Ligand binder design. Structure first.
Ligand SMILES: NC(=O)C1=CN([C@@H]2O[C@H](COP(=O)(O)OP(=O)(O)OC[C@H]3O[C@@H](n4cnc5c(N)ncnc54)[C@H](OP(=O)(O)O)[C@@H]3O)[C@@H](O)[C@H]2O)C=CC1
Ligand SMILES: COc1ccc(Sc2c(C)c3c(N)nc(N)nc3n2C)cc1
Length: 186
């Protein structure tokens, strides 16, 4: 099992969702960006695992579930089996990570990508260890009802470049945004 990572797109006021969808209109190249980063594995003959909360899962369009070419794991204490289309079900972040260390997944999983929502991100970001955050900064305020947790810059270093990630400002549908990579190790 290799790297543990978070990926998120967030607005200036730290919003990541509204009524079970994104706070901004669909940004095609940003979704493609998300798809490329979570799918691509450096170790041949392996796949990345994506871990999400239940409400994240149901937010993804049915036709795109499971996220293709990745192992899909959903977090829930209420569910008793994985949702239709999901691959795995765990009851805690600890459990999900324990699981990747079982003999089955052990040698099938490269990168693990936490893709949301707020409470999964919170726990991961505040747990000791080597962790990257891939952060798309939507450069506007947008009305939101769910929020990215605080990034402690004493611990998370913004990297000045990262291979496969554009540094310059992007824009689609008149919304400007940029990509960022943070790393801590503690
Ligand atoms: N802009 C972006 O990058 C992203 C946007 N989103 C958006 O943000 C929102 C997702 O919202 P959010 O409310 O944070 O929902 P989550 O996807 O985190 O789902 C919350 C539920 O998942 C389960 N859960 C969460 N953490 C754990 C855990 N550690 N262990 C076991 N179960 C857990 C619980 O379900 P149960 O009650 O069954 O135990 C909880 O009610 C949506 O609006 C979505 O569109 C989501 C990801 C990224
Ligand atoms: C590809 O089909 C999908 C449908 C909905 C979502 S929700 C989403 C998430 C969870 C997401 C993320 N973690 N990081 C970035 N940079 N963009 C994202 N989006 C848009 C993600 C994928």
């Amino acid at each position: 099992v290799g790297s543990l990572n978070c990926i998120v797109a967030v607005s200036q006021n730290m919003g990541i969702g509204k009524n079970g969808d994104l706070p901004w209109p669909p940004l095609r190249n940003e979704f493609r960006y998300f798809q490329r980063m979570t799918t691509t594995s450096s170790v041949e003959g392996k796949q990345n695992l994506v871990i999400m909360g239940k409400k994240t899962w149901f937010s993804i369009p049915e036709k795109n579930r499971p996220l293709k070419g990745r192992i899909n794991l959903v977090l829930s204490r209420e569910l008793k089996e994985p949702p239709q289309g999901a691959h795995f079900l765990s009851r805690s972040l600890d459990d999900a990570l324990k699981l990747t260390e079982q003999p089955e997944l052990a040698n099938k999983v490269d990168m693990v990508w936490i893709v949301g929502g707020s409470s999964v991100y919170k726990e991961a970001m505040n747990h000791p260890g080597h962790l990257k955050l891939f952060v798309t900064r939507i450069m506007q305020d947008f009305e939101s009802d769910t929020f990215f947790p605080e990034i402690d810059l004493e611990k998370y270093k913004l990297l000045p470049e990262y291979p496969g990630v554009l540094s310059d400002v992007q824009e689609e549908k008149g919304i400007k945004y940029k990509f960022e990579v943070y790393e801590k190790n503690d």
